[PDB]
Amino acid sequence: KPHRYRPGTVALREIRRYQKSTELLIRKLPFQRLVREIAQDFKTDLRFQSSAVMALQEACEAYLVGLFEDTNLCAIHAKRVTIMPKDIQLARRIRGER
Amino acid sequence: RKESYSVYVYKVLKQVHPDTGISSKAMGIMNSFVNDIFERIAGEASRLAHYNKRSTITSREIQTAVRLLLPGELAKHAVSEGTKAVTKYTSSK
Amino acid sequence: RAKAKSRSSRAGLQFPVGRVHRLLRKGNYAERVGAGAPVYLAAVLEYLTAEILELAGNAARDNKKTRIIPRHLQLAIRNDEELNKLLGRVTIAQGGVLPNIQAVLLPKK
Amino acid sequence: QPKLLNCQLKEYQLKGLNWLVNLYEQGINGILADEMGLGKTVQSISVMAYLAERYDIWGPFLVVAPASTLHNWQQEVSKFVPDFKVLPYWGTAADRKVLRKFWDRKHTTYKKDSPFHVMITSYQLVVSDVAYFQKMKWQYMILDEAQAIKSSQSSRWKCLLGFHCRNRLLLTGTPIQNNMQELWALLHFIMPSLFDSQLKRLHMILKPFMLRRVKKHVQKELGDKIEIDVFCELSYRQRAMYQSLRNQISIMDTLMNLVMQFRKVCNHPDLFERAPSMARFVTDSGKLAKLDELLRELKEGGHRVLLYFQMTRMIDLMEEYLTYRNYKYCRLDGSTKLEDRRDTVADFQTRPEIFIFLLSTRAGGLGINLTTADTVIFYDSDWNPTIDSQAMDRAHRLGQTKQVTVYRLITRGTIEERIRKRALQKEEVQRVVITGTGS
Amino acid sequence: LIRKLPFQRLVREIAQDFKTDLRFQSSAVMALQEACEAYLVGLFEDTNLCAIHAKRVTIMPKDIQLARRIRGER
Amino acid sequence: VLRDNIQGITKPAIRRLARRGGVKRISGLIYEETRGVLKVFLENVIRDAVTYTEHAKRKTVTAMDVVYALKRQ
Amino acid sequence: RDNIQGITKPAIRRLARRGGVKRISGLIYEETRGVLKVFLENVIRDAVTYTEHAKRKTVTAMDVVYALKRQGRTLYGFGG
DNA sequence: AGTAATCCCCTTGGCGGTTAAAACGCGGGGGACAGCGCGTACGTGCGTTTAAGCGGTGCTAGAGCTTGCTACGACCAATTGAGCGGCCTCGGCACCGGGATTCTCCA
DNA sequence: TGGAGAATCCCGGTGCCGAGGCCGCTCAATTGGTCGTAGCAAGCTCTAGCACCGCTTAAACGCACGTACGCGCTGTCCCCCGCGTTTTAACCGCCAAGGGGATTACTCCC
Ligand SMILES: Nc1ncnc2c1ncn2[C@@H]1O[C@H](COP(=O)(O)OP(=O)(O)O)[C@@H](O)[C@H]1O
Ligand code: ALF
Ligand SMILES: [Mg+2]
């Protein structure tokens, strides 16, 4: 029989890994292509500096990491340990994005 | 020819922590921090002059700006540092 | 033609009272810039730079590092209540986050 | 002569070395203005090898060339002194940064151990890296085809003027070019203490500062440039366009536009707007018809041909025509990278299966050998006559294997007439302003 | 909604910390009151969503604290 | 000196403000929590409004000083 | 094209770990992709507006930083 | 003074591989969620009393505006040295490996 | 309580690349004098902010009391986690291209 950590144990071990670190968590090349797509939707035959798509990635990831915190507090404010779409929808409505 | 605060940041760093270095990316955030707070103060000083109908950005404008933009204890310590720097610029030339 | 000594040296500052005078003019914040206004501002810019780097040098020392890193700036800025209030809408490149796990998430007995 | 050369100088080149040495030892500058193909790139090496063997100067020597010539220098310098140490300062910025590591400032005269004696670079690099070319001092400078300097308003004149160089030598094909102030820029460059800012007196004051031998007196085995100004004729499509475009002159009062727009359709109407078949494409240009006929006659003759174009888009259209027929070819224009220039010139010179070389007038005209061609066709002509002369003498050159012939595809009745007439005038004027060996 | 006189006295009481014997223009009080009522109304909205999200209908102090925490007021 | 005037925003007033926010039912602990919210807000408005007042060396706080304090929120 | 699907499930997981989240409904992932692109659809259009109004045919790092700063998300490190 | 060629540089695109990250399958566990019972805590209504609101009176602090001038900043030309771009190097930090200590889970 | 084993830490070694200091120079900060004006100063006007009184009645408070709703408990089931397998595309490097921006040449027009 294999040894097995319980459900939720490695979620905590992962939290302690992605907190306490600074690496970018979205893969570089996929984010570039999404940015180029959204750029095409606004102005064709644009170009981007490397530091422009880096600057744009850093702002996005910080926005999503900071958003999840507010949804975790919504989840934890209900009885739940699990975040659900209605927590994002409440968080963004309290923030005033929604 | 670009211009940077890096040499002035180093000469503050080597005062507060003469042993301690700074990485270029950290120095970049120091440039961004100085630029952002310089412009935030000057922006309020502009508005304080504008509100008063005055053509001059005095040290009085920057004092009232500093007491608006900074938290209560950073405000008082900064106002202290600023008021003595001017008081030693005055009584020189 | 006397031997020039910088307006910073006379004010007693590292930060450049000259650039702060020019930049207060180039930005056209107002028509006229007082003589002491660049001095007062250059002193506050120098002071706040020391506040950041004092706490960040401590945090660098805690990490057993000789050299300050964007991580240490974030830790300093968020640990100090007033820097955190001064920068509560600023994202720092490669700052990361504070280690913070909500109490309910830690395992039961 | 310096035994370091591992080569003989020719008779005329040895007197040329003596002149160049005399100017150096007397502390004065001059122009080596020998006719194209007589060997100025060799006399330039001989004086460095003398400064090595006679005085152990061993550099630093700066050698500034047009970009397509830079491999001609790199190779021939290595030939005419096997022991010289050559720095090839060209490439991307990162490559030049790696090359610049060898610019020792600390010795103003280089030891024979120094990592170079001679440095070859582009007329664009000396202006692009000027801040690095300043903060340096040169024992000698060659400007390898100095008619590039002839505009005193050019930055490459303003910059190279002040490089802190103890002596300077210009090589040129014919220095007189458009006029006399455009000569003074070359004279001021070498001797700004003397010249600062009647046509009988010049011959007696340029003589100390110029040497100007000519290929009737030198290399007599290079039989004359047989030439056929063809005076071919428009075709129906071109003349419909030409008349519709010449009508614009009647409406006018814009030749600054139209002379190009006229010469575009003089070359091929598909440059203006494209037609679907080779029968139309060959025959709807009077030039391309007469060219295709002549190329057939030449290929049956076993000739190998250089075609010069003024418009690079015509090198594309000609390259369609060539690929739609049986002809193996090379291309060399100002869009090519320098290694492509090196190899295509070497490829053409390697093997006689290649029929035709397409060359742009300027990028392909200036200064590297094509001595296994035998026929030169100006499909279009340079409106400065001197540049067509350099192009002709890339074939008509020392080592030229066979009797050269030259063709020029003048379209009768077009704006092409004005251009070759005025080139004919200007080459006459240029022989008013010079005739005589110099020294 | 708030009674005018006890808001004036609240304003006076608060202001006395910063400068003794300030004066307040009558319009300046209303500009503070109309901002405070609008701020409290707009916060109770955000708390009511927190209650409704936690399946309560009765708003509770942890709803105010969650509203402010997400608005960044704390 | 004045004191305890934060009890001048009564509990019915907090009801009206909550009902205007759509609240159906109100915990009895809200009423003191609302005062800890209003006080921390109204302090940091008036701090700026007075800082704008005294800069012009005046003594009445004007509606313009309030507007500039709110504009700093 | 749908490079929004290139914001994969593990990446959204990693971001939620840094956000301190223990357990994630599988419905969160498609919600998070919708939220991310609505962010990018505002920052890039302002960053492009800067490049267009300043008459350049490339987008620089500082165009983004002005675009962020103008929407209240000041970024230090990329100029700024 | 114009327009076209030439040449630099820097961004985009493609090709190959290699391996690290994403996707997929599957058991089970424990957390989401509906259901239940109670009890206490909030909404309602009434009688009480408290002071907010209004109309009216009185005073003076000080907001707001004009006059007069000189102290202070704008403007220019000559001087110079503080600050930037380029080049070099060695030491700090990362990355690895291997044994030591810690923590988690089923017994 | 123990134990096994995975996961996290530590200690020393390796090496590489970026931090810290040096060098040349330019151009931006400083010195010196001029000149205009604005805002600091003294002075008048009267607005409106503060204070007090007295009345009215609508708003606030204390209390009774019913029942609507918050909260801990119980049961279930479904669905997201932990771990092995399969596979795909992100990363790296190297070559091409093209494009654009600066410069240079030559002619026509003024
Ligand atoms: N003395 C010589 N011995 C052998 N070859 C020579 C000599 N002089 C010139 N050549 C050849 O003449 C050819 C063209 O000479 P070059 O100097 O390049 O002409 P240009 O005057 O246009 O530079 C070169 O290939 C060179 O090898
Ligand atoms: F001197 Al030449 F082509 F004539 F290089
Ligand atoms: Mg030559």
Which of E52, E53, E59, E65 to mutate to probe the A interface, most A CBs <10 Å? Answer: E53
Please name the residue ranges forming H helices in chain A: 9-18, 28-40, 50-77, 85-95
CA-based nearest residue to D358, from D284, D291, D260: D291
Are the CB atoms for A26 and A14 separated by under 8 Å?
A: no
Q: Which residues contact E5 (CB under 8 A, 6 or more apart)?
A: F8
Q: How far is CA B6 from the centre of its chain?
A: 15
| Whether F57 CB is under 7 Å from strand H | yes
Give CA–CA dist D322/D305, Å, rounded: 13
**Domain range for A74:** 1-98
Strands (E), B1-93: 21-22, 56-57
Q: Which residues contact G17 (CB under 8 A, 6 or more apart)?
A: A11, A14, A15, A17, A18, A19
Give CA–CA dist B9/D10, Å, rounded: 68
Pairing verdict, β D226-229 and D405-408:
parallel
CATH of domain D3-211: 3.40.50.300
State how far the alpha carbon of D80 is from the alpha carbons of B5, D69, D77, D218, D431, in Å.
55, 16, 5, 20, 33
Q: Tell me the CA–centroid distance for residue D150 and ligand 2, in Å.
A: 16
Q: Which residues contact C63 (CB under 8 A, 6 or more apart)?
A: C69, C71, C72
CA-based nearest residue to C89, from A66, D5, D162, B60: A66
Tell me how crowded residue D8 is: count the other CB atoms within 10 A of its CB: 9
Return the CATH number at A5: 1.10.20.10
**Amino acid identity at C57:** G
Pairing verdict, β D405-408 and D329-332:
unpaired
- The position carrying tokens 């933009």 is B69
Resolution of this entry in Å?
3.3
Give CA–CA dist A26/D358, Å, rounded: 51
Give the pair of three-digit tokens for residue D32: 């080596």
Give the pair of three-digit tokens for residue D23: 């100017």
Helix (H, G, I), strand (E, B) or coil at E27: helix
Domains of chain G: 1-78 (1.10.20.10)
Are the CB atoms for D73 and D38 separated by under 8 Å?
A: no
Q: Which residues contact D136 (CB under 8 A, 6 or more apart)?
A: D60, D103, D105, D163, D164
3-state helix, strand, coil in chain G (%, to 5): 60, 10, 30
Give the max Cα distance, chain A.
Answer: 59
Give the pair of three-digit tokens for residue D272: 């203006």
Tell me how close the Cα of G72 comes to any Cα of chain B, in angstroms.
Answer: 12
Q: Measured in angstroms, what separates residue G25's CA from nucleotide I79's C1'?
A: 9
Q: Report the run of H or E that residue A49 belongs to, with start and end.
A: none
CA-based nearest residue to D336, from D94, D36, D70, D87: D70
Ligand 1 neighbour D397 (Cβ under 6 A): yes
Q: D379-402 burial string, b = 16+ CB within 10 Å, else e?
A: bbbbbbbbbbbbbbbbbbbbebee
CA-based nearest residue to C16, from B72, B9, A95, B60: B9
| Whether D272 CB is under 7 Å from strand H | no
Pairing verdict, β D168-171 and A82-83:
unpaired
Q: Which residues, listed in sequence order, are joined to residue D64 by a DSSP beta bridge?
A: D121, D143
Angle at C89 between CA A70 and CA C96, to 5 degrees: 70
Helix (H, G, I), strand (E, B) or coil at F61: strand
State how far the alpha carbon of D402 is from the alpha carbons of A48, D225, D388, D427, G46, in Å.
56, 11, 20, 26, 68
Pairing verdict, β D30-32 and C32-33:
unpaired
Pick left, alpha or beta for residue C12 (phi over 0 → left; psi -120 to 50 → alpha; otherwise beta).
left
Tell me how close the Cα of G38 comes to any Cα of chain C, in angstroms.
Answer: 19
Point out residues after which chain A has a gap (C–N over 2.5 Å).
none
Sheet containing D375-378: order of strands: D226-229, D405-408, D375-378, D305-309, D356-360, D329-332
Long-range contacts (CB closer than 8 Å, 24 or more residues apart) made by D258-263: D259/D415, D262/D414, D262/D415, D263/D310, D263/D311, D263/D380, D263/D414, D263/D415, D263/D416, D263/D419
Give CA–CA dist A11/A1, Å, rounded: 22
Give CA–CA dist E8/E14, Å, rounded: 10
What total number of domains does chain E contain?
Answer: 1
Q: D47-79 burial string, b = 16+ CB within 10 Å, else e?
A: bbbbbbeeeebbbbbbbbbbbbbbbbbbebbee
Q: Whose CA is nearest to atom 25 of ligand 1?
A: D369
Are the CB atoms for A56 and G40 separated by under 8 Å?
A: yes
Are the CB atoms for B61 and F65 separated by under 8 Å?
A: no
| Whether E20 CB is under 7 Å from strand I | no
What total number of domains does chain B contain?
Answer: 1
Give CA–CA dist G8/D288, Å, rounded: 59
State which approach was used to obtain the coordinates: cryo-EM
Q: Which residues contact F70 (CB under 8 A, 6 or more apart)?
A: E31, E35, F45
Give CA–CA dist D193/D197, Å, rounded: 11
**Domain range for E15:** 1-74
What total number of domains does chain C contain?
Answer: 1
Return the CATH number at B62: 1.10.20.10
**Domain range for C14:** 3-107
State how far the alpha carbon of D145 is from the alpha carbons of D9, D170, D309, G8, in Å.
21, 7, 21, 61
* Alpha-carbon torsion (D244, D250, D255, D257), positive or negative: negative
- The DSSP result for B69-85, as a single string, is HS-HHHHHHHHHHHHHH
- Residue D261 CB burial class (10 angstroms; 0-12, 13-18, ≥19): middle
Ligand 1 neighbour D38 (Cβ under 6 A): yes
Return the CATH number at E24: 1.10.20.10
Give the pair of three-digit tokens for residue C47: 């002071």
**Amino acid identity at E5:** L
Q: Which residues, listed in sequence order, are joined to residue D405 by a DSSP beta bridge?
A: D226, D375
State how far the alpha carbon of D324 is from the alpha carbons of D278, D320, D321, in Å.
8, 6, 5
- The position carrying tokens 């505009």 is D151
Which of A22, A25, A26, A72 to mutate to probe the C interface, most C CBs <10 Å? Answer: A22
Ligand 1 neighbour D368 (Cβ under 6 A): no
What total number of domains does chain A contain?
Answer: 1
DSSP type of residue G76:
E
Q: Which residues contact E32 (CB under 8 A, 6 or more apart)?
A: E7, E11, F42, F45, F46, F49, F66
**Amino acid identity at B61:** E
